[PDB]
Amino acid sequence: PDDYSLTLPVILELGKDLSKLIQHKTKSGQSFVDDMIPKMRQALYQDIGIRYPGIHVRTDSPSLEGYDYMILLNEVPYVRGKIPPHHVLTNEVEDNLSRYNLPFITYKNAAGLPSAWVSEDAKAILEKAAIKYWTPLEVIILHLSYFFHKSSQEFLGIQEVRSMIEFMERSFPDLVKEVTRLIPLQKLTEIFKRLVQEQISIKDLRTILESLSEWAQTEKDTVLLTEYVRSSLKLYISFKFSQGQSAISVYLLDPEIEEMIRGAIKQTSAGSYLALDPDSVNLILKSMRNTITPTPQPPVLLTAIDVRRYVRKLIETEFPDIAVISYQEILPEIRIQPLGRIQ
Amino acid sequence: PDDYSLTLPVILELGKDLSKLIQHKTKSGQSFVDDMIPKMRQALYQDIGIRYPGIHVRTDSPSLEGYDYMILLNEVPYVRGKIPPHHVLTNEVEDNLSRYNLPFITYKNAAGLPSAWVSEDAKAILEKAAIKYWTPLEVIILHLSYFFHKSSQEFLGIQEVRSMIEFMERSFPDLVKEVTRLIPLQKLTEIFKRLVQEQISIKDLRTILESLSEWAQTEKDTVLLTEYVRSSLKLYISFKFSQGQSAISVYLLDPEIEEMIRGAIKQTSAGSYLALDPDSVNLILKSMRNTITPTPQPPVLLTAIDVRRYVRKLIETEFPDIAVISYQEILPEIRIQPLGRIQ
C-alpha cells in the first residue's frame, strides 16, 4: 500500500501493434517474453561478466505509436525506436541490394544496428540469397542487447559484484579470502567495472581472481591491477579480438606517437594522467580518421604495454568502440597482420 | 535464470561421428568417458603433482564436422582437430608404409604426436608386424594429454594448493602445521607453481613439505626456498633427466659465462633481478644456438649452484623446454656426460 518500492532498472514499452505482436510465437514455437528475452540475458552473461536485470515489459503503451518501442533506464526514457510495419530487417550493402530487391528503406534505430528494411513477403527470396533477416521482435531483441552492451556500468555495482564474489566463495573460499584480504570490495568492483568498460569479459572469475591474488601482494593501484588482469586474459583477448582467426588484424602506432605519449605522464600523488597536448591529440585523432577504414566488426589497435591505457583514454571519445590491446595481452605465438600505421 | 555459473575449465566438443564413436566400448571393454579419460587424468596426476579437472564432453556440436573435435580452456576454444575416418594412427616411417603397400594419410594433431594414419582394415597386418597403432579415441586422449601438460599452471592455484595441503593434513598434521606457520598459502602456491613450471613433480608432498619445514626457519625468499626444495628432490631429478640411465647427458657452461652471469642484482626485493647487458644476453643466446644440436626428449643444461635460477630466467623465452639443473640436484654417483661447453 504505502511501503517503498524499488525503481525498476529496465522497462520495455510497446505500442498497440507491437503489443498485439508479442502474443504469437516464432516458427520454432518460442515466447518473446519467456524464451527470447531470457536467452538474450543468458547470451549477455556469456559475453561479459555481468548478469543483467530482467526486462519489465509494458504493453499497450499510451504514449506510443503502435509500431514504436521505448527503453527506459531506471524508469527514465533512454531510447525510442520504430519498426517499419510488415517488414524484416537486413544488414545488406547498398550495391548488393541493387539485385532487384525493392524495399530499400533506411531507418537506423541505433548505431550498432542494421538499417536496411525489406518486405516480409520477401522472406523466401531472402532465404534463397543467403540474406539473414531479423523479425521485428528479433530487432527489438537486437536493440535491447545493444543497449545492455553499451551501458554495462549501469548494472555492475557494489551489490552485483558482491553477489558474484559470494557465488565464487562456494568453491573458492581461500582464493576469495586471499582476494578479500588485499582488495576491499569497492576497489574490486572498480576493477571489474574497468574491465567490462572495454569489453573484457569478467565471466572467468577464477582466472581474474588468481591474477589479482598474485599482483595485489605488491601493487595497490586499481588501474595497474586492471592492466595485470588484462595480461592474464591472453587466451580470451586473443580469441575475441582476432575473431577466432589464425591471425589478429590490427592497426599500429608509429613509434614516434608512442614515445610522444610516453612523455606525457603525471606524478601519481593521487593518479597519473595524460598531459594531452591539445594539438597533438587532434593530430593523432586526424591520423586515425584518415588511416582506419570504416566498418560494417570494430577495429583493433595494438600498442606498447606502457601506453595502452593512455591511448584508450586519448581516443575513447571519438572512437569509443575501438579495442586498444597490448603485446602483454595477446598469446606469445600469435600471428599479427598489420593493417596501417597511424602517423 | 538469475544465478551465476562456474566457468568450465575443460570442454571437449565432438562432431556427429566422433560422438557416435564414444558410444562404443573398446575391444577390451573400456569406455571413453568412464575409463580412458579418468586413467589419463590419473597418469598426469602420477607424473605431475597436479589434480587435473574433469572433462565436460559436448556431443553433436553444431560448429564441428562429423570427424572434428575442439578443446576449450575456460570456455574459450584452445585447439581444433580432425580424425581421418575409419583409420588408426601410427608412428611408422611413411616410406616403410609405402613399402608394405599401405596407403597412408598424413595428419599431425599436435606437436610431438605421430602423423601416419592407416586404414583400420590394416589392424591385423599391423599387429602381426608389431606396429604400434592408436585408435581415434586413443588419439583424442593423446591430444588431451598434450593439452593438460601444456596447461598445467591453469589448474594450479590458491584453492588447489590448499586442497593439497588439506589432504596432507590428514596424516601429517604437525608437518603441515610447521610449514603453514612459516609460509602463507599464497607463498606456498607460488613455490609449487615454480616447481611445476620447470617440470619438477610436486607429487611427493612429504619431501617438499619436509624440505620447506627445514629451510623456512632461516630463509624467507620464495625463490631460494624453491631452490632448496629442488635440491631435496635429488633422486627424482636425477632419475627424470638422466631418463633412468647410469649417466646424465648434459651441456655445460664456459667458466667465463658463469662468472659473467654471477654479476646479478640481488637487492632486498623478495627476489633478485639479473642485470646483464642486452648484447651480452644476445651473445650467450647466440653461443647457445650455435652449440645446442636440436633434439629428436629435451636437452639438459648443467650449471653451477648460484647461477642456475638466473640461467633459467635468461634462456626460458627462446629455449623454453631446456631443463636447467645444478650439481646440487643430481646424485653424486650419476656420471656426467658432457656435450660441449657454451662459448
Numbering used by the authors:
A (entry chain E), B (entry chain D): 363 to 658, 662 to 708
From the primary publication:
The export apparatus is composed of a central, nonameric, ring-shaped inner membrane protein, termed the export gate (CdsV in Chlamydia species and SctV in universal nomenclature). The export gate does not directly engage the sorting complex, but is linked to the ATPase by SctO, an ~140 Å coiled-coil that is structurally similar to the central stalk proteins of the rotary ATPases- the F1-ATPase γ-subunit and the V1-ATPase D subunit. In T3SS, SctO is the key link between the export gate and the ATPase and is poised to transmit mechanical force between the ATPase and the export gate. Presented in this manuscript are structures of the C-terminal region of the export gate from Chlamydia pneumoniae (CdsV), both in an unliganded form and when bound to residues 25–110 of the Chlamydial SctO (CdsO).
The crystallized protein contains residues 345–710 of CdsV from Chlamydia pneumoniae; several N- and C-terminal residues from most monomers could not be resolved from electron density difference maps. CdsVC displays the same fold as homologs MxiA from Shigella flexneri, InvA from Salmonella typhimurium, and FlhA monomers from S. typhimurium, Bacillus subtilis, and Helicobacter pylori, with four distinct subdomains (subdomains 1–4). Monomers of CdsVC align with RMS deviations of 0.26–1.68 Å; the primary differences across the nine subunits exist in subdomains 2 and 4, and in particular, the cleft formed between subdomain 4 of neighboring CdsV protomers, as evidenced by the high B-factors observed in the structure. The closed, planar ring is stabilized by the buried surface area between subdomains 1 and 3, with an average total interaction area of 1127 Å2, as well as several salt bridges and hydrogen bonds between conserved residues, as noted for MxiA. The CdsVC nonamer has an inner pore diameter of ~60 Å, with the total diameter of the ring ~170 Å. Residues lining the inner surface of the ring, which correspond to subdomain 3, are highly evolutionarily conserved across prokaryotes with T3S injectisome machinery and flagellar T3S, while residues along the outside surface (subdomain 2) are highly variable. This suggests a conserved functional role, such as substrate secretion, for residues lining the pore, while divergence of the outer surface may allow the export gate platform to form multiple species-specific interactions. As was shown for MxiA, conserved residues lining the CdsVC pore also include several lysines and arginines, which are critical for secretion. Density for the loop connecting helices 12 and 13 is observed in the CdsVC:CdsO25-110 complex but is unresolved or only partially resolved in the structure of CdsVC alone, despite this structure being at higher resolution than the CdsVC:CdsO25-110 complex, further supporting the idea that these clefts are flexible and become more stable when ligands are bound.
